[PDB]
Design a protein around this ligand. Sequence first.
Ligand SMILES: [Cl-]
Length: 495
Amino acid sequence: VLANWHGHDYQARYFWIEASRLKNPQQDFVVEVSYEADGPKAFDDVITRYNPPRRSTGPDRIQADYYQIKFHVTQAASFGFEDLIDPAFIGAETFSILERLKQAKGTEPANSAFHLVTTDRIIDEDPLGEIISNVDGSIRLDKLFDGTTDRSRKGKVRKLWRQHLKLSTDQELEQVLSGFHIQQSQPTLEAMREKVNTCFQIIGLITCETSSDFRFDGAARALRSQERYRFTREQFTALCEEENWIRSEAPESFRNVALRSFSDGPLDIMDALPEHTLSLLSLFEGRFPSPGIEWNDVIKPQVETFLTGIRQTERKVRLYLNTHSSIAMLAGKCLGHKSGVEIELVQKGRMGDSIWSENESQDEPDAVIETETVGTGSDVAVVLSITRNALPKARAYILENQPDIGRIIHVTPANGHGQRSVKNGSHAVAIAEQVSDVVMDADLPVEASLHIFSAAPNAVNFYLGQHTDFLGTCVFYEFDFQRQRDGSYLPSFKV
Ligand SMILES: [Cl-]
């Protein structure tokens, strides 16, 4: 029983995720990672330092990211702009988040980034939600600094913060807020355990599975007792050697590639180099289009061009995937069975991170497959119920909107849909293969289309996309919880 970090296991796991970069050959510019377990202080809970300074969307390369991690509580609450001036919000008697920010801006180099990390969310109609970027969490200075007076909606925020910080002008406030980020709705503690394991496996370290107690939490407490607070690349390699953590010192070198369509959190933003990264939410400047014509005309060409560029130069690819289901399926089609690209998938999401490949074998029973006739048309639907039963909603959409569909093929894993219905990449591939066999045996004429409705994680959708080349003309669909308050399908890509 050792003394915990002030941020406890959440802070320790954040640190381990950052420190794994010290032994990542594809992030050699990360030169030091440190933690402050006797806090909170001023944005030093975790610090990641770069040499050369890291690439940035802004005008200056960033020499360090500084993290202030709000004490993790399992039940997530809400906060607004008024909370940023309250010390209790960061679990302290004095010094708010903004005062800590002002101090850190006083002490640290100019080309620095500062992040407030929390599993809580911004209040729905609070002004803070309007000044925090959906792309990367950065403060939206063009939005907060309207050029209005204290009476306006943004003026009230400016006044509260300016007077709390004892500044004379909104210009000084803008100086203080430059480089500040709020990362809301960050992963749960359990997802953080999964992310630590994924990061460690990728860099060739051992992982801690099944065990109800995480080994690396105790390792972090022991490091604190040894007063080892900061690690260069050499120091982290030395720690890994001393701890007997190195599984392989030379794992198979895959080229890291990233495909994302949601928010770019700091944990994931450097998964691949910028030239090997496609972040769709950034291209749409934080406003992702509804599934439809814009997907087939804007998103599809972008994804196809990006993945053709990857395919013609790379033999082995580690694909970090955090996107919509049909985009994952399109990605699979672009890197299909024809490409000759050996694929390792890193599935990232709110559930956590997982690694998929065809290395582990499987002997699961065949998926239950049931065909139903619903009309006279020559089109065919395939419904994959993997995470949940998708057949009712797909059947409703089809009855209401696709008169040319004459047959619905329903596919469900042997032991039913659920969170873990697909074992591994080999199981996903085998399911895709039996789906392809059934569709090919259905003998669709060449003019007809195969409509694909899927309720599955990104990796399963990717492996299915890899086989859509065998199925001819296809229409991919997106399930949206908007038009119908409990969800409904919309066509996205026609391939
Ligand atoms: Cl004032």
